[PDB]
Amino acid sequence: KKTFREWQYFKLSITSFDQDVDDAHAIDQMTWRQWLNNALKRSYGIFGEGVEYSFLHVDDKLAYIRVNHADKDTFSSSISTYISTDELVGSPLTVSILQESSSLRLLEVTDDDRLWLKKVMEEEEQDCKCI
Amino acid sequence: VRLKSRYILFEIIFPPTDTNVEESVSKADILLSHHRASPADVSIKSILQEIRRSLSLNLGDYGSAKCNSLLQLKYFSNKTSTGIIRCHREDCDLVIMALMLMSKIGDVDGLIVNPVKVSGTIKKIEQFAMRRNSKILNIIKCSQS
Amino acid sequence: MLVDLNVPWPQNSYADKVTSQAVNNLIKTLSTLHMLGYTHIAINFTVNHSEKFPNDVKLLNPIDIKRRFGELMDRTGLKLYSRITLIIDDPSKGQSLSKISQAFDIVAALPISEKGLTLSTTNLDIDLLTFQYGSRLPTFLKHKSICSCVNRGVKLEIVYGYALRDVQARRQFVSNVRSVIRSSRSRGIVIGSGAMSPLECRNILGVTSLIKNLGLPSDRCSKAMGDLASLVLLNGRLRNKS
Amino acid sequence: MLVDLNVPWPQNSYADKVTSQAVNNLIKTLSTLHMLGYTHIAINFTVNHSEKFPNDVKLLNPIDIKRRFGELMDRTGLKLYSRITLIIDDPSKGQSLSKISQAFDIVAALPISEKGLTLSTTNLDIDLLTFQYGSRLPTFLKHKSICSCVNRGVKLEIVYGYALRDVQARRQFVSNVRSVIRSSRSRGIVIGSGAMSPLECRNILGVTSLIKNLGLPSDRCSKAMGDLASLVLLNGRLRNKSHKQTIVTGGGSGNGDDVVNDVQGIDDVQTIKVVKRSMDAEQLGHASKRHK
Amino acid sequence: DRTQTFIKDCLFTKCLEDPEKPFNENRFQDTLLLLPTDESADKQLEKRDYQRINKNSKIALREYINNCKKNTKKCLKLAYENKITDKEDLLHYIEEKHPTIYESLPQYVDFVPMYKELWINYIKELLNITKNLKTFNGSLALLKLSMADYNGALLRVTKSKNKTLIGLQGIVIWDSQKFFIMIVKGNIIDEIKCIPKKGTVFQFEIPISDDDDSALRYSILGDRFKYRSVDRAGRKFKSRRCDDMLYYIQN
RNA sequence: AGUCUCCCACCAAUUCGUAUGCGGAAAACGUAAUGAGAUUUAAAAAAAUUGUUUAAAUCAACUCAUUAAGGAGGAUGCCC
RNA sequence: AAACCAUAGUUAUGACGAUUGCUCUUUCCCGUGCUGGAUCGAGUAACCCAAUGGAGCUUACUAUUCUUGGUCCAUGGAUU
RNA sequence: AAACACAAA
Ligand SMILES: [Mg+2]
Ligand SMILES: [Mg+2]
Ligand SMILES: [Mg+2]
Structure with a gap:
């Protein structure tokens, strides 16, 4: 009756106050990954650490995270809980989930990286339809 | 209203880890070599603290917080190594996985934990324990021949 | 009834001869397995794809269940089966299965490269496919090859024993088991116990709860663990005899 | 619409004097809650029971919404309400609610004992029931008492903002929230964030995810934050502004002049509403026909 | 023992x-x-x-x-x-x-003039509407209005569950228990209006034009207007639910 | 669910020998026709149950006061 | 010293998977229509839970937190 | 917990 969802996207964005410390430091992709690995291990044990997640279109205080449909609850309970402390910033970090989607239909800017990811995702879509 | 309880019966089994000695292959021989005895340094607060540490170490913070609401050891005696752990019907899987992931006691090593019976009342647990104890005596009487 | 088909044999190559202590430890492990409650036991033997296979028929299996475990089979009341896994890396020094499939019962494979997954999904008459749960999985498990290998009959084997060894590889084991559960879509998932010591043996309830918390539904666990394992054993027996 | 009713004020006793840093931090957190998005914010003030209430009326409210929040709202665009939580444990003779209830808008309670809980559930005229999620629960909460209370009025409040304080408090917070939700039958639940700084604030999605991980469905969370929050604001507002639900001092013409919405127009030093003459006897009764 | x-x-x-x-x-x-x-x-x-x-x-x-x-x-x-x-x-x-x-047929030009004045003067004397407005007290005024009589009062339906009842002005001819009776005028409309009280909001404005042109903005709630006292005081009130007022905030 | 009622031995009778609007073993039990009533009332307001807890323009709802079963004759109204 | 007896029976009444049907919304066709048919989607409610059995009464439920039938000297719009 | 009482509240 229902189609099996592969995973689910999550719109992540950093919220760091203290404009001076904010413009002083500059986060990157590895920073994001380390923050996630620290949050999962702080809020959960190996259960949270074994959560599958990849990085797509990382920007300045913006990133998109795809999480399995079975672990959306574990991800959304851990993201809104943890607050970074002495990782790379003098001012602790707090993240707020802007929006969520389960159909890939979201467009912020007219860039083409979403188009390329969409192209590879439908070339996998027809491939899982046939296979 | 009713508080939905679910008791858990577990057994402490000691595998005869000794490769230098030859062993007898039978039913009652291995039943006796696995049910030998529990060490003296065994109590209720020493097993509860160990399982509480393992729960936080495997699940995490929220996994221990949701599970430690009604986590108590109701009946346990070190002579037969049989214990009854009370928990919710929601967190039964968590307690079972923690009892499976039990590594060792802080001072006693080389032991495994086997969950046998899970039920929502103590009377059926006692009946099943009596049935298991009666079954144990049969192979013993048969092998004593 | 339960089926355990991932008991490792303390021998990697053909050159190294087994010792009495290893056989004693294996006997301890099998007795602990029967104590916790099991019906079918299928010990596994690991070998490399580059190692030279001997040109024999009566020497392919350095197990000899009849003279070693045949007495335990009569006394304690269980059965043993032969299983061999193929640690494949590169399509070279191979192209031989009609002689290794008749001696042993179950034939498995262990791909560690992206070409190994293709060679396993395309041109291997295997029944189960296992990964290195301890270390990192080779590149990425996708639905493309997994669906095509499960639709024909090949299942994916999960080693719940590898987690009980150390503390650090637990993270990698969990990250691999959740990945393979997400990719396999929870149909062809068989479970095995890869423990060589009796101190890493568990029961059905604990393993079921672990696999359920890892991402597998409750019906899938029991249905697979019982029926798929029994069917794999039957298919292996049919491949050996007729 | 989103309502947060437990914004704490940096003062517990009347002997304390609030410095400018705390007011600046409160202004910053109000701006933070407004920028991302919010509709109603009611700041909280906490005092104990055995203390000596000052025999004043014009000094009971150290909030002065017209003084500094009057500086902030014209640029912010939202409204603020003053509320008080009563820390009542032992039924002492100190009881002067007839002044603080009429001076403030919302009156809540913080019971620690069983007798205090019983008297606050039966006789004490309050609006919300808040428990000490930091400490241990007083007793095993009953079902019939909470159901009769939420049918009679007062509902329970859950504050997810306290779980962000330390690590050892999270287990007790979850254990108390589970018991409250199990005993309250998920009817009278109002959610709030007790954050003292803008850095411990979250979005509505984080809130609904946390509560759905706690055990309450997300649709019920949305309904309790949309309708139940508005209703618990309305009750505590018109129980003090108007009489006992018989005569209202505010007349809603359109869709913005509401007793809880219109806050700068309605006078507070008195209860009158001086408006120009807009209702005559010669105008046509039918609004579809009435034209000016 | x-x-x-x-x-x-x-x-x-x-x-x-x-x-x-x-x-x-x-x-x-x-x-x-x-x-x-x-x-x-x-x-x-x-x-x-x-x-x-x-x-x-x-x-x-x-x-x-x-x-x-x-x-x-x-x-x-x-x-x-x-x-x-x-x-x-x-x-x-x-x-x-x-x-x-x-x-x-009735006559609105006959019904408005004395009724409006005799009610306005009565309310002005009851609420103590004086040239100066620093001698007021809201609590006692609301208590009096709850005790006051609305026989021959001008009320306007400003909010209601039905989107068509709003905006109707009329003067009371009799105060019933379930319906409210007023009279309205239109182009040819001379209809006696009966309006339900369960879920409607009314309001009455008192004109004051001594020096400036101002009026008091008061209002009643029909839903809870049925369980009030009549001309006397001392009636034990019960908290009902304060829950079916969602239409007040909704629109 | 509820601090409501009743059956769960009998009695050609100090044992509710109660042919009493109908049904029913009983029931603080269901329903039918007419008249009236509102702290100025037979009784609701200044045993149980229920957040609001009958009505008080008309309707609707509650309470109380009368109407014993069957057969025969006459009168009236309807198809005829 | 037992009378131990329930087409749930004494703190139990589990765990997920699959199918039809029900309510609205964005679509195409024959005949207007038809508990006419098929895709894109959302939801399956609440009160609440037995402890010996049956009947009567009262009291809690169904607002994007499933539904159904009728009535209204209730109002809103249109024709005669 | 349920279920019971010319209790108790
Ligand atoms: Mg009961
Ligand atoms: Mg009871
Ligand atoms: Mg009962």
Whole structure:
């Protein structure tokens, strides 16, 4: 009756106050990954650490995270809980989930990286339809 | 209203880890070599603290917080190594996985934990324990021949 | 009834001869397995794809269940089966299965490269496919090859024993088991116990709860663990005899 | 619409004097809650029971919404309400609610004992029931008492903002929230964030995810934050502004002049509403026909 | 009693399984009660004539409402037949061509002038509306308004569950228990308006034009207007739910 | 669910020998026709149950007061 | 010293998977229509839970937190 | 917990 969802996207964005410390430091992709690995291990044990997640279109205080449909609850309970402390910033970090989607239909800017990811995702879509 | 309880019966089994000695292959021989005895340094607060540490170490913070609401050891005696752990019907899987992931006691090593019976009342647990104890005596009487 | 088909044999190559202590430890492990409650036991033997296979028929299996475990089979009341896994890396020094499939019962494979997954999904008459749960999985498990290998009959084997060894590889084991559960879509998932010591043996309830918390539904666990394992054993027996 | 009713004020006793840093931090957190998005914010003030209430009326409210929040709202665009939580444990003779209830808008309670809980559930005229999620629960909460209370009025409040304080408090917070939700039958639940700084604030999605991980469905969370929050604001507002639900001092013409919405127009030093003459006897009764 | 209690316990341990159950839960009563289970003439005249006057006035009001209901319909039908729009022509045409149906029709120009003034003066004296407005008290004013009489009051329906009842102004002719009775005027509309109170909001404005042009903005709630006191005080009130006021915030 | 009622031995009768609007073993039990009533009332306001807890323009709802079963004759109204 | 007896029976009444049907919304066709048919989607409610059995009464439920039938000297719009 | 009472509240 229902189609099996592969995973689910999550719109992540950093919220760091203290404009001076904010413009002083500059986060990157590895920073994001380390923050996630620290949050999962702080809020959960190996259960949270074994959560599958990849990085797509990382920007300045913006990133998109795809999480399995079975672990959306574990991800959304851990993201809104943890607050970074002495990782790379003098001012602790707090993240707020802007929006969520389960159909890939979201467009912020007219860039083409979403188009390329969409192209590879439908070339996998027809491939899982046939296979 | 009713508080939905679910008791858990577990057994402490000691595998005869000794490769230098030859062993007898039978039913009652291995039943006796696995049910030998529990060490003296065994109590209720020493097993509860160990399982509480393992729960936080495997699940995490929220996994221990949701599970430690009604986590108590109701009946346990070190002579037969049989214990009854009370928990919710929601967190039964968590307690079972923690009892499976039990590594060792802080001072006693080389032991495994086997969950046998899970039920929502103590009377059926006692009946099943009596049935298991009666079954144990049969192979013993048969092998004593 | 339960089926355990991932008991490792303390021998990697053909050159190294087994010792009495290893056989004693294996006997301890099998007795602990029967104590916790099991019906079918299928010990596994690991070998490399580059190692030279001997040109024999009566020497392919350095197990000899009849003279070693045949007495335990009569006394304690269980059965043993032969299983061999193929640690494949590169399509070279191979192209031989009609002689290794008749001696042993179950034939498995262990791909560690992206070409190994293709060679396993395309041109291997295997029944189960296992990964290195301890270390990192080779590149990425996708639905493309997994669906095509499960639709024909090949299942994916999960080693719940590898987690009980150390503390650090637990993270990698969990990250691999959740990945393979997400990719396999929870149909062809068989479970095995890869423990060589009796101190890493568990029961059905604990393993079921672990696999359920890892991402597998409750019906899938029991249905697979019982029926798929029994069917794999039957298919292996049919491949050996007729 | 989103309502947060437990914004704490940096003062517990009347002997304390609030410095400018705390007011600046409160202004910053109000701006933070407004920028991302919010509709109603009611700041909280906490005092104990055995203390000596000052025999004043014009000094009971150290909030002065017209003084500094009057500086902030014209640029912010939202409204603020003053509320008080009563820390009542032992039924002492100190009881002067007839002044603080009429001076403030919302009156809540913080019971620690069983007798205090019983008297606050039966006789004490309050609006919300808040428990000490930091400490241990007083007793095993009953079902019939909470159901009769939420049918009679007062509902329970859950504050997810306290779980962000330390690590050892999270287990007790979850254990108390589970018991409250199990005993309250998920009817009278109002959610709030007790954050003292803008850095411990979250979005509505984080809130609904946390509560759905706690055990309450997300649709019920949305309904309790949309309708139940508005209703618990309305009750505590018109129980003090108007009489006992018989005569209202505010007349809603359109869709913005509401007793809880219109806050700068309605006078507070008195209860009158001086408006120009807009209702005559010669105008046509039918609004579809009435034209000016 | 101690040795007696020991005897009772050694006796209960034979019948019951937990001997210290009743003594703990207090089921062993120490006492057994043994008892079988156990100038009026003119006053009556005035009461009867008051009963009769009430019973007659009820039917009179009902039939008056029905007569107005039928007369409005018939006169509007005849007006649409004759194609006459404004009221100043229609009422004169009816008077010059239909004498009977004209003594049954009401007159808004007859109903507004004294009623409005006699209610405005009464409310001004009740709420103590003075040239200066620094001698007010909101609590006592609201209490008086809850105790005040609204017989012949101007109220406007500003909010209601039905999107069509809003905006109707009228002066009271009688205060019922479920419906509210007013009279409205339009192009040809002279309808007696009955409005439900369960879920509607009313309001009344009191004009004050001594020096400046200002008015008080008061309002009532029909839903909770049914359980109030009448002309007296001291009626124990009950918290209902304060829950079905969602329409007030919604729109 | 509820601090409501009743059956769960009998009695050609100090044992509700109660042919009493109908049904029913009983029931603080269901329903039908008419008249009246509102702290000025037979009784609701200044045993149980229920957040609001019958009505008080008309309708609707509650309470109380009368109408014993079957057969035969006459009168009236309807198809005829 | 037992009388131990329930087409749930004494703190139990589990765990997920699959199918039809029900309510609205964005679509195409024959005949207007038809508990006419098929895709894109959302939801399956609440009161609440037995402890010996049956009947009567009262009291809690169904607002994007499933539904159904009728009535209204209730109002809103249109024709005669 | 349920279920019971000319209790108790
Ligand atoms: Mg019951
Ligand atoms: Mg009861
Ligand atoms: Mg009962």
